[PDB]
Amino acid sequence: SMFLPPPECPVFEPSWEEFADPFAFIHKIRPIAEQTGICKVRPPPDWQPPFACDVDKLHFTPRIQRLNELEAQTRVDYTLRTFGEMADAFKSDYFNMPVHMVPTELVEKEFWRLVSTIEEDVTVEYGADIASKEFGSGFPVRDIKLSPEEEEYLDSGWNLNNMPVMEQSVLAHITADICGMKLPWLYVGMCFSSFCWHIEDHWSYSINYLHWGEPKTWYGVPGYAAEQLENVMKKLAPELFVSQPDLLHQLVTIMNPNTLMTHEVPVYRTNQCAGEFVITFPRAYHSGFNQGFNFAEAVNFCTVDWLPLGRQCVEHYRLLHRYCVFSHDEMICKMASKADVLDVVVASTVQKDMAIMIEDEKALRETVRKLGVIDSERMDFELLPDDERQCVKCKTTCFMSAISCSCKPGLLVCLHHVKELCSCPPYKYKLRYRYTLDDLYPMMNALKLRAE
Numbered sequence: 001s002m003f004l005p006p007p008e009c010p011v012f013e014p015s016w017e018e019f020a021d022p023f024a025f026i027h028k029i030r031p032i033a034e035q036t037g038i039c040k041v042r043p044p045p046d047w048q049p050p051f052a053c054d055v056d057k058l059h060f061t062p063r064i065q066r067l068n069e070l071e072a073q074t075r076v077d078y079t080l081r082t083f084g085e086m087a088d089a090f091k092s093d094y095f096n097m098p099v100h101m102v103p104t105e106l107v108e109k110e111f112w113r114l115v116s117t118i119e120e121d122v123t124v125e126y127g128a129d130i131a132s133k134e135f136g137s138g139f140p141v142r143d144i145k146l147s148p149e150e151e152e153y154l155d156s157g158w159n160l161n162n163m164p165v166m167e168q169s170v171l172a173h174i175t176a177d178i179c180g181m182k183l184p185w186l187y188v189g190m191c192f193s194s195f196c197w198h199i200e201d202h203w204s205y206s207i208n209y210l211h212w213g214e215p216k217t218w219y220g221v222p223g224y225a226a227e228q229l230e231n232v233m234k235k236l237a238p239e240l241f242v243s244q245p246d247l248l249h250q251l252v253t254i255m256n257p258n259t260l261m262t263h264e265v266p267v268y269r270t271n272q273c274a275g276e277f278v279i280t281f282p283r284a285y286h287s288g289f290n291q292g293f294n295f296a297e298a299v300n301f302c303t304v305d306w307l308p309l310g311r312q313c314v315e316h317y318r319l320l321h322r323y324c325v326f327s328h329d330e331m332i333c334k335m336a337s338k339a340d341v342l343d344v345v346v347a348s349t350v351q352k353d354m355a356i357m358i359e360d361e362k363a364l365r366e367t368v369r370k371l372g373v374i375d376s377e378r379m380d381f382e383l384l385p386d387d388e389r390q391c392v393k394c395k396t397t398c399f400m401s402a403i404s405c406s407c408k409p410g411l412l413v414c415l416h417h418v419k420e421l422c423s424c425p426p427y428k429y430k431l432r433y434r435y436t437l438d439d440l441y442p443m444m445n446a447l448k449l450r451a452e
């Protein structure tokens with residue numbers, strides 16, 4: 001009746017031994033957690049990274065949020081003190097109760113009531129921003145003299161600043177600018193402030209740490225049910241699925257998990273409390289809302305497990321004409337070019353993705369040759385700004401190769417869309433390529449030698 005809470009997601013309590021290596025741990029729990037999309041991780045009792053900041057010197061500009069189910073939202077001044085004051089007063093006035101006396105079950109039930117009720121027009125605010133000088137990480141960073149306890153946590157794998165640049169991580173090696181994706185984001189929550197249903201760019205993992213405050217309530221869907229969920233959403237809110245002009249225009253929405261459950265989409269929930277992690281797995285849809293004033297920090301990451309999904313994601317973006325954050329192939333080749341310093345399991349996994357890449361590229365080049373494209377010239381795609389190497393048709397970021405024509409200077413298509421460049425005959429076209437097939441096989445060989 002009204003709201004039936006989804007079943008709880010898995011909760012893990014690793015020993016210090018298990019916890020010592022986050023990537024080994026994530027790999028370990030993967031068979032369980034990828035069935036539920038999200039999971040919660042409680043660190044050992046004494047793993048307690050110190051949080052310290054001046055609530056008066058940290059400033060941010062809040063986003064305003066209307067709370068209407070199925071309404072389109074875009075994904076995209078307070079001090080921490082004055083936001084907290086606003087947040088606490090809002091919640092206490094809303095329920096006419098002290099804040100720690102409002103039950104989490106009640107806040108959840110009320111959230112789904114208010115987003116579905118037309119006559120209510122509750123609006124709330126929240127902070128979402130990457131770490132900057134005006135507002136930095138909640139974890140200790142090297143810089144100001146740190147206490148020994150802060151020094152304990154400087155190099156932790158679970159310190160979310162480190163997570164991207166570890167050796168079992170793959171986003172580490174990207175030299176391209178992907179700041180929105182490799183740097184942690186900070187989130188200052190208040191009662192009912194929410195994150196709409198979404199998956200991460202390039203189907204990456206994410207990991208979210210609640211530094212302090214009241215809980216964050218999550219709903220998650222396993223990766224295998226992603227298209228099921230999108231089909232439900234497409235039927236109920238087709239506006240969200242119209243083509244978008246860029247990455248800064250992704251449309252997202254609030255939707256009751258019971259609606260998904262009614263359509264046989266599996267959904268799991270959890271209340272993430274202060275000091276706990278939530279991990280989301282590749283292509284795992286998630287959404288949720290904050291129970292009260294709180295402070296979270298999150299970052300994307302990519303393991304070796306993710307590599308073939310990353311390749312699939314970019315193919316999916318092509319089919320949808322969605323812009324890429326980076327070139328997957330460019331990342332693969334960057335890693336190949338550094339094969340000698342790669343971790344060995346990483347090298348082994350990159351090698352396998354590269355073999356697919358090369359075999360696909362071979363077939364694509366054979367096809368465009370048969371279309372009458374004869375002329376060719378090497379081109380260092382990685383030097384071009386992204387907006388100068390997107391396929392005219394499908395918007396993919398080109399790297400392995402593209403087609404150009406003197407008739408349309410500066411315009412490019414990927415090898416899937418040779419017909420979409422211009423009206424000139426194909427003998428006027430050039431194949432622009434980063435590597436010959438003969439360049440590529442030795443690069444893959446280096447990875448093989450490293451992997452042994």
Ligand SMILES: O=C([O-])CC(=O)C(=O)O
Pocket residue numbers: 187194195206207208216296298
């Ligand atoms: O998607 C996540 O990691 C959760 C999120 O944005 C938030 O805490 O507002």
Ligand SMILES: [Cl-]
Pocket residue numbers: 067068069114115116117118119120121122
């Ligand atoms: Cl409403």
Ligand SMILES: [Mn+2]
Pocket residue numbers: 198199200206280286
């Ligand atoms: Mn997310």
Ligand SMILES: [Zn+2]
Pocket residue numbers: 391392393394395396413414415416417
């Ligand atoms: Zn294309």
